[model samples]
Target: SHMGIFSYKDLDENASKALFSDALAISTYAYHNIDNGFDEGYHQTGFGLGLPLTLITALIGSTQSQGGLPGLPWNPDSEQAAQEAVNNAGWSVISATQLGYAGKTDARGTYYGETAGYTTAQAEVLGKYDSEGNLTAIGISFRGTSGPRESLIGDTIGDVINDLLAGFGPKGYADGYTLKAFGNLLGDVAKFAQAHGLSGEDVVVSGHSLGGLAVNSMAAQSDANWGGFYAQSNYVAFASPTQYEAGGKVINIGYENDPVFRALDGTSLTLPSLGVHDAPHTSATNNIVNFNDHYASDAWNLLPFSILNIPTWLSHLPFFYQDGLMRVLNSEFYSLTDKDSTIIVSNLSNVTRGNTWVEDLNRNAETHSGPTFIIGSDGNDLIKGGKGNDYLEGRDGDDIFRDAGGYNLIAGGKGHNIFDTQQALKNTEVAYDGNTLYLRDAKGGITLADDISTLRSKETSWLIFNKEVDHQVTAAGLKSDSGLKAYAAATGGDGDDVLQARSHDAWLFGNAGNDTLIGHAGGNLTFVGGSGDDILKGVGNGNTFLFSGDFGRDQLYGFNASDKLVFIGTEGASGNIRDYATQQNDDLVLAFGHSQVTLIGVSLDHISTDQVVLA
Candidate 1:
């Protein structure tokens, strides 16, 4: 990215009045606290939004670091205008483990979109030597792409300020305010994860590009209480919505033609602008352009191989030409459905044999698109993932080994696991690692093993926790079950958990501590697995085991074809879960006392249960 940018119209009117007074002093210190009511469509967000709440400074309270803002008549003082806004929009700069390893240095040597950056004296030398891992305090400071843009931000008022506020007039937002400062940023990330133990293991917010959109607005304002979230290269464009499963793990990344996830999807009503003013994703390992034999572009065309993407003038532009259609719209559904091991990888490269006046040499891995990973540290570490699947999870320990989309071999039997990606298809497209979290959405179509086999099925559904994450429920005790292997979601932090839903149309939600469910099998019912011996199940028929929590295991299992079984008991006993599901239509009902209902070993009565709360 070192060529183009002849001189971007020189708009440092001082950096456009310090970027419109730092987005209006964080929307006026979060709307002057408005008596703590915040209604006008609630905006505030995260550490109060962006650059550590207006260019660093010990985040308003201070222990003493500060020192960032400096520079931008495209170089004023210089981070070089955020490295020339990532070179001038061609884009580059990675870290967070150099984005987990940008494809192992493209398999070694030459390097494409290299990586690394940070200042304010490298966040005050990692806040003062981050333990001791300091390599001159870890001096990464990198830059490569961005050698373009004479005038990009969606070519003059189109990178979506509500469609350039319509021919440049009344668009609205940019006034900020999202959700009452994410409700005080989820009460300061639940009192800083209970005063520093990190509440077990989440709430690990990160930054880059507008401090990675203020750590993706403090991981969507604790998006209900996020335990783990990463927002590398967060040039923002309406992502701060929050409360996803209100539990944990959130990710936001964009690079390789980044333009902040396509330059602002109309502040997320979804796509239309391309004029993106800052927010070009980067870091999380390193951003590499596609297959310039190994990425970071050398010059090719029509989307073959790829890197630093989005050319063709601007490809149609929806949030910056739809960042590969927003990973196809985050692979359909799954907004991190509570969490149960997710691993994705990306790296393309073709840049037509590396633009050579000479040197290129990927030789021609076949112009790109294959190899990368195939592990089995024991349990097929990545049971043959095709276009980026990998869910190895020996239970995390910096254990990530990805091969772009077509390669995967994730083994977590040893922790410290990582190998990532956050969609960076078309423009300057180099999705190296995406700061490793699991914003999840390789954008496929139904399959998490079908949703873990529908957890069998009952009614109550939803899991995604992580209890101190140990592993090896298999693969030879998965390295001591890595601490008991929790995290179907909620990685330790908020504590108190006991989930279990194997399969069959399962959803079972237990968000927020003190959780302990055991709903087994599908259709008809709620839950009852408390104190300890809980096992609520209904093999088939709209179930609801319902429990406030005291001890309930409304167990009932029957599945063949036609199914119906309902039991909403509080403590009453009605036993019948053993015609066992060998074949024929299914049914198992045992509702004790009150109206007294019992049907054991029963098969297809054309079933239909009735009883809102019978004990």
Candidate 2:
């Protein structure tokens, strides 16, 4: 829509998109360069005579062998090489001038650290001016990791060590070298802003990856005045190493599968903790977004280097973060814009043209052709699939999946789920194969996976489908079979009821009752104490306790780190558990505005912060 970069308020979807593009441009400028002779030759020739020659030259350059052969003398770290690289980076400043930033300021190779040798960092500042040449808006962007391709040596040994140190250091503070470098860069930015008679509030600082960590750490650290600039200025981080509970004006966007965003999880190198806050800082207005999709094409070229061996390495790319925010800005559903959020698109065609490069690269997947792939969040969600052969997964929470008449594959990954078909059924074939339910209609069939608790036909109609080999469709519901041993199910009605898990993995739902729910030993169980004074005993291996606002006084026993406590809050709810926590005697009490829960025989220190979720 041709909106200027300065037109939007900081940290909004539009501002995030703009800053991410700027970060990508600045980082690319810092890491890459074109030969001066080739550039000058192109400038000397007219477009009609130079276009084809330029294409041929680029094609030849792309196939040339990189990473110099052994024994061949090379000195990219030499003074001449460094000068050429810095000279090439000047193009970025000229590019910014063309985009309405008439005033440009930059500081590069700002050295820091004394003991472990000095690390160099680079940052650029651009100021937008009014017609009278007065500065109105300022943008500050920091360069991320210096790649080896940039003069072959990239940053000094000190900076490379700081990059590696980021993974092991405490999440609350920036590593020593990174902090020092960032302070030096910020000093330059401050001096320039001061020269222009501008306040920190008018500045917007953004970065990606390691640069993202710099800005994020500045906003989180408690000591010194580093947090002061962050407190006044707006900050946006993309795929930062650690997440913080930031202020209202700050936005931290990360992909759901990004490795750097969850770098602290070192157990399984491929799998990182999902959507868990890494820092202790608490703020209500932090706009933390976790998008679920990854662009496989972005990582395609890196497959030769085993980058694909790591899960979702492509998600960390700044372009992917930009695409996610662009989707949010263009979405018709404004409710999806809440902070600390996740969103899935039901129809791809609405958001993208079928011939786009991204869509072309993804065409190999069956769902990408026509079917929709929908993934829900940890909270209660109402998901509806499109009319193609769709794949839908509701991960946790009491979810409701609405079927839209296609041969669909649906999996309710934990939590009590309801599968709804808008039409009234007649002569419907139902079959269960121990783990999945195969339901067929006149149009097509639905392959339903485990953890589905209820079945619905039309509004206000409910049916219970029990796990059985061959189920009959009667007026009540599908019949149960005694021989089915994989899943054990228990449900309670409106009155006060008691429920217990059987021998197998179970789904226990206390629907509208004052209930007592107990789990079997060693079995993974899901407990949903609907609405009443409930007593939930946790004896299983990996149990999940689901709570909502209407949940009454609930008492939990044997709640450990392995078990998850999921609190489903309303829109704009604070995700930090500390906001609802207090200690009384030997127990930890979590007071939701409408209800409270008592962790019996458990103290606040006994629970790891990751075990709790405010979804």
Candidate 3:
């Protein structure tokens, strides 16, 4: 195949080069030829030759018959190659639209609308074979205008196309305008391969810009098409949108300066302005020596770079793509997935960040100094407030805040998230006045920068902070958290909430509900029973219980068998433990740590053998 994921090292340079040009020729046919060139010279192919020449060279004859691209390498498996195949394929379609001007007899720009339903909106799929004339693969070109009706149509004739390109529960997903442009072309691609008996053969779908969007949608939709047969496919989309359908190893050849790829927003109603891609992926094109030099003139010279793209807009041409790949054929490229819409900032000391769509980013400061600054997304984000007084926002979702290099500030944005402070610096502080929260370091003391009441506003019910939160004793003798604390006076509404007293002097009277009580290690507290059938856990911590109360049936989660019992009221209260089986190796300690010279009204069975160290 001209463009697909190959065993890079195993590929033959000469064979690979030959295959690449053929793929380029196939791409040329994606654009319809009308009277020599695209009406405008600006959109004309730089090569001067039209689509007819390209088709005859690439499709009718093999690469051996057509001259190969000069100075190009044979690594088709690379991101560079993945894109070059599309870039070199031929630049023809620039302004192709879906359902063109209500169907004229001509198959020129309206190649897709030659008929109703079956007409491919903005692309075409071509079948290719090997030297032995055996079916080798299928090449598809995707780009241009698409409509709602075109997308609704399925891969087959019998399947009625829908008017809207909505989400497909599992077999489908969020449909983009570009996806709709592809219409049933994917099913058509699969159909082409089947007709040629190349169902299991390789397929390469390449496109630039809108074409890029279509190629991706085509391959994904084809993977699980309603049609019976399919092909093993991969793609290279130049300046394409991020795919939420996820991994097919579709290497997107994007520009660090290409505004169109970075600017187009998508289908999410929740994120009307936010595009679909949110995860981070490493650009396989990075580290190429003159990458920045390629487009530096556009920004510096202040030229009006149009989104018209490709053969028209030379800035987004396949020439640059081909040139890039030529530079780094086997240069140990670096790549990581999930980078379409990720935010990456390096070696920053201070900053503020916020976006409506996302926040899955990495901010590295390397040294344990200064501060890292961050803003949070209204949606969800996994934010790392790097070293020093880094301001981190653990906003939306279950955000994992890595603020280990503390004295930093963190705002537990709008979700019930887990805050990891185990690695936080010793004196970090946090404040929340709702909209803005600050975590900073102060040598003076641990006073919250913002008022504490706002942290418990209408939007929040609980706050769980972990790590060594330095506790400070105020002048008023109140032990309060310096910058961090979990303080909830009462549970709200009517629900079952498990509450445990972590401190002392507790007068735990269960609320008007069934509550389970666990005895704390603090001795100053009294276990006042709640009407609930709650069990009391007096885990070795001596607890005070009412001698007799009208409490419901309650069980005492007694400590280890050696736990001692002491009475503070009516002697008959001893009956509470009568059913408590002793001598089962968990012999109970009768009583100790008190003074007693005589036994007055105590019964004989009430005393244990080990007891009465009593005189």
Candidate 4:
């Protein structure tokens, strides 16, 4: 009997590794007929084979003297026909033949001026044999998108159309064109499987990018297919977009921050229903050929010349997927089911670095090493300083900076930033003299180049110092002259003060004037509103709002289910929110005594008794 290792139920680590590698190789092989590997320095010089003409010819009949041409006729069972078809198209067949498989591969809608309507699908049905010439395992590999520089007329246009439709299509179902092409491909594969006396359980279907999307949709609608072939077939998809219902024994692999694997809203394109495996690879170190900077201004008086510019775009490439999978296979410590949200780098031999544009732009990432320097993008970032003189910058996002035992130069650019001294506070002293906030430790000190709030922790208590205050404090003593106790006593005069907290339990005090207290990404913080009307914003996680007698009116923003509102020293106030909560327009108003707190963007129904506390 044929080996059942390819079945989803029996697929192990080694089988999966082999399947992924072969899929990527076969996907790359599909590109040969398109651009001959785009590395051969070949340009699409003829307009007849361009994308526009291909679409036009597919819509209307070809205008040439030959009218329209049919796809190359080849028999799936005959190896000679497959080799003949591949050679006739001027494509090499070595990619398949070398893997102990027949050279018979089928490519449809790839020929120039073929009147197939926006259908550019290619698949190779590969069969592995035993020493006795008996078939062991079967593989069906699909190809992804082609580029304009390579196959301008053939696969690029068709593949891009499929992408747009499938990506933006209605939930649960893919676009009609992609579904139709997938059905046809499955039919062909089924015929080949039937001829070989093999079932779908003996086969593995794999692809990358657009091809991955196709197979994902097939896996979603597996029961609808003939003979339950799709349901029984094992699947491996790389950089695939989301298909709402894709399930079964499958593994969908994607690199970190690969744009194709994410939607425009920065959500994973692969749904939770699919088995997701995040590959560990850094895009910062993977540099491809970039020629966007050197362009002639006078050439055609048009836009700048650019090629393969984005560094993270390399994560979407098939070669990178292959490389990452190979690494996963070789390492015993690596698990295929692990997912990573932050990009971490440790134990650097030399000074590792990143820019505001390339690193931490789309995701939260961190690097830990001595003498390292890095810059963040225009998004929320958590930057941890090194133990030996490091430079860090938080550009734009409401970021958090944690200090180590190092003399670091830090800048909190733009958005509200936090300087957390929880780690080094025991061995460090913090001082702010009008302009710069300095932190000195055993090794050296850190210089704050911009105005940043400070978070210090003592035992179970935490405090976030206002950015507007100038103070000096140490781990052992909170100085009465310029420390938390003194800082809390100082009022905001007549102007408004802005205070921010880090991802820790903290107490944020806003005294006198109309001040604003902002919470970080994750924390259970308490916002204390003193005199005048103030604004308290809880960015995320659970938090608390403390209200005392005559504390003045305040507005709470971003109050969610995990947050609580507490009332202290209210003689007749009840712990229930419904007692004081009333729906006023779009905001929920809690009026008691002389103080009233308005919850913005929240209705009265949004509050519950469990979220209110009385002391």
Candidate 5:
């Protein structure tokens, strides 16, 4: 209004289903001649409203354009320069002021607060735009706009009455009559870009006081008309819809240094998850709320007033959509409060990550593979788990790797490491000689230890563990004398053993007796069995498995991968045999290796304690 941008008076609607049909054009009859207290119009005539209003309106609209990720501070210098940058993106910068908007119901909550600037207007204006988020026209690089004035203007109250007579003819002061008006006479010429039909550029809506409230409400309504946007914006919350949801990116810049957005939530602020105060987060996709940017730059180890790091692209923002604005739209949202002269805030761990994280190494020709991680630039903490033939390395952390099903060449990558149950050979009767668990040879066709000293190992194998989460091992059979206990994967060789590998990559097994196996890792498997049938579980991680009816209290842990259950119906016919089966989660895990094939099955209950190795 005053500076060519929107102001508070735009919000007083009655039965006004915004942007809908059958809607009465709220009266602007209030803009006529002057009364005793104010000036008169007709003193206002430029042949037309000039370029100043249009330019200034567009200027203010730029401030709320990007509120992507949050928790960064706003800077004045950087924000001003960013306008030119976004302009380079083929976006026309319009509406350059923090015009205010607000609309609230009366005591009855019946939407009757429409008398612009009469009741809550001036106060709301002061509370929102005048005091909150105050940035001079120069801050957003806005040139001044001095619109037409009412010359035949009388005094203060005089201009009020005259303006009423101009638009409404005579019934201007009819008691319950609705009154609506525009600031600077140059109406809604916000952005008039020449190309792409309104869908190409970023469409942001903002205003102070009434305009501020209008910014949000209007944006909420326009989401239906407009489809995509580079991003959106919001600030200086005087009045607001209880909650807001958006389809695309949004940034709600808040200034706690000023006491306005605290209309309702300020009394007893409570953090959703934990801590004394809630940092900046998205009730919606709101981000980059800066109380001030000083503290943020210090925390991020960034340069002072580093606009590139703040979430909102205000004064402290960088080159248009290039630096800070780009990053802010990409960073987490932050929050703060005037906790005595300063604002402190941070981004939430949630709501910031984009969709699509890495899947396992296995390539499913059925589904489209995508969004893989950049190896060297973003080094992983540890990489041990893989499918088939995977080349993995644990860069820095102590790592444990397992090549269980197929062949895998895992390197410790300069860290203390261990590899267990190397998957180079066929896992069959020959691989399990009574007690000693045999590993596979380089050729999947040969038993790992059939020629122990001469056995060579190929590197392709099933991934055994990931270091992303925590995991510990518990099994007694897979122990090495040189303090080599925990492994990426392990195989219990016929024993009522209790395995414990409490550190890095690990796995455990109870091959043949009443045993207990515990596995903790990004991915792991635990098997327990002996005597009769057995029960196996991986209480922490997501796992899978297969069951074989050999049931000597055999419990196979849920493999971190797809497992199969094999029904070995035929008994071990040394001579006499007995048929046995337990209806537990008896499953099977079958994986073809580079050189060999593996089929892992476990028994569920101790009702059948029969062991057999059928080759």
Candidate 6:
């Protein structure tokens, strides 16, 4: 072993792992290092490791305990202020520098090309320091430069002597020649940390492509006495091929059919806990196909891009990962926490997962273009499905399912369910008969099951035409002409019920209990009170009632006394009124519309002459 200042043997594995374990935490600086063009050539240490001087100065002050801490950015700012923001959250940039090819055939050459200054790499180290100046943790962020660096650092080369010497694993445990270059670079950074009286743990190493390939090597070359982290819980690599792992910290995010990440498939690697969540979505339109689905952005749009814009302009931007990071965190499998200055992420398991979403109590919960499945558990849920066919399941509560177009299957087990849809297509396909509204398609027609109410309907009845429900309904329709055709008829089932109609020619039957039935405008309909003293009132023009079948003694009031008391049924039985002298209402008016009223057993002799005339 060459024991000089560049010796490749002595290890500090635990400390290096700790230093680079915070993937997103370190990624903030990693991305900033790219395309960094400031005054006087590109130097990592200049301008406070490529950060603005004002922020650097302020950070230095805060680190020295001189004043209040700085603020954090949830996103990247053009001036790269997030660096200072995160630094205030407990991290400070320790060193930032670009590495050059030192010699011909150096271990790095096997992967990064042997040519001098041809293919380069940049690295940034961030440290978590205590108030007294001792280090608590560290993170390493690295990436490949454009052109030659991109190709060379990404080249596939075999694991060699250096990997074994560094104690990564047995023969095949190494990923490629790129590991050697990164291991050496990470060693330099770790060595720098040691010289500055710092030791690293809770380390996080992260990046994309070239930098992504080097993280394994960074861990491999760490000093052996290095502490351990639950590797499976600490790492994330984006759009990069899986690298070396003798089993631990397994997580990878990639686009399906990605020409890059698909190239490598190593058997010695650990199976990622949340392996690739997606492959590229298949394209329908040429424009969608042209757009890059490989970025983290497309994944949230469900990997389908049919938007307007130049496809190339959308490629390889930081917002891709920024969008992807949030999209993935939004899943049930992962959770997020906003810690002091830092956002922490962790895996979730063994929890009752739901396909539900709760919006602000008063916000208009319409147009769901984001998620296909969601629920509203508490309070009144106003769920409206958009474009796509969806299923809205309301947990036996009072849920208002409203929609004009898209097919929705609603199953609200039980309750005084209300179906509100006033924008229903105004087509005669909905048949408005004497009392029931009929819905017809190629499947012919069927009256909507009774019991559910239609608060503001277009076709007198709310038709779940294709779906089924648990209970009968008491529905109503809009007050417009379209609703006028809603021949709504409701039968109040067992238990006290309330029934109301929307337009004329409607019918109501209080079945098995005391109920309230409100008639619609010009409601030339019938009310059959079955077994209960129901309060049946209100009429538009003409209304009728049958009391004998429901000898429970129902009361009928609120009529245009000129309204006809049309015969209750084919049974021309004129209902008998006991004290006929006082209640001389529309019953006498019934004799004018239909001449067969005497068959209902009404004793017309008990009525006065003026009561027999039209009101």
Question: Which ranges in model 1 have alpha carbons more than 4 Å from their true place?
Answer: 1-139, 146-533, 537-615
- Which tens-of-lDDT digit does each residue in 532-584 have in candidate 4? 79999987766777665466889999999989876643423243567777888
Candidate 3 segments exceeding 4 Å error: 1-25, 28-110, 113-120, 144-189, 244-249, 262-279, 282-294, 298-314, 326-615
Clashes of each: 146, 0, 14, 2, 122, 44
TM-score of 2: 0.41
Candidate 3 positional error at 155, Å: 24
TM-score of predicted structure 1: 0.21
Better-scoring candidate (TM-score), 3 or 5: 3
lDDT (10s digit) by residue, model 5, range 74-192: 31232233323333332222231322123432221112123453222111110112234332111011000011122122222433342233223332221111123222111121222
Task: Evaluate all candidate structures by whole-model CA lDDT and list the values in order.
Answer: 0.25, 0.49, 0.35, 0.48, 0.25, 0.37
TM-score per candidate, in order?
A: 0.21, 0.41, 0.33, 0.39, 0.25, 0.35
How would you order the candidates by TM-score, starting with the best?
Answer: 2, 4, 6, 3, 5, 1
- Model 5, position 45, has a per-residue lDDT of 15
Local error of candidate 1 at 391, Å? 16
lDDT per residue as tens, model 2, 1-615: 112222224455566555545444443333333232222222233123344553343222222211211122331222234334333433213233233332223333322222333344545455556667677656655555653233324453445555566654444335343455545445555556666787777666666667666656555542345435535776666556644443444455554345466344321222333333232122221222233223323433243212234434534544344444444443333322343323342211112211211112221111223233455544565667655544566666776776655455576777877776665534344444334454555643334445676655542324744321332333233643522222245767787888877775356667676899898887467676778888899995678786643678889987877887865432224456777778888888988655788998787777787677554
Model 6: per-residue Cα lDDT over 37-60, one tens digit each? 221111122221233442343222
After TM-score superposition, the amount by which residue 232's alpha carbon in candidate 1 deviates from its true location, in angstroms, is 24
- Candidate with top TM-score is 2
* Between candidates 5 and 6, the lDDT winner: 6
Name model 4 segments beyond 4 Å from true: 1-10, 33-116, 147-151, 169-178, 244-246, 264-312, 335-615
lDDT of 3 by residue, 1-615 (tens): 112111112345444444444443444334322111111121221123343444333322232221121222331222233234444443222222321222232232323533344344445544454557666666666533222222322332212132123222223432433344444444444555566666533666666555555555555555455352432455555555434235443555554334334223322222311322222234222111112221322333243333433322333434343333332231111011112212121111011112121122221111122223344433344455443334444434444454434243355555554343343433444422222223333331111121111221112125744434323222122133445353212221223335565564333434334555565665433343433444445544434332111234444454332333322211121224433323323233232112111122234365453322100
What's the true lDDT of residue 269 in model 4?
Answer: 32
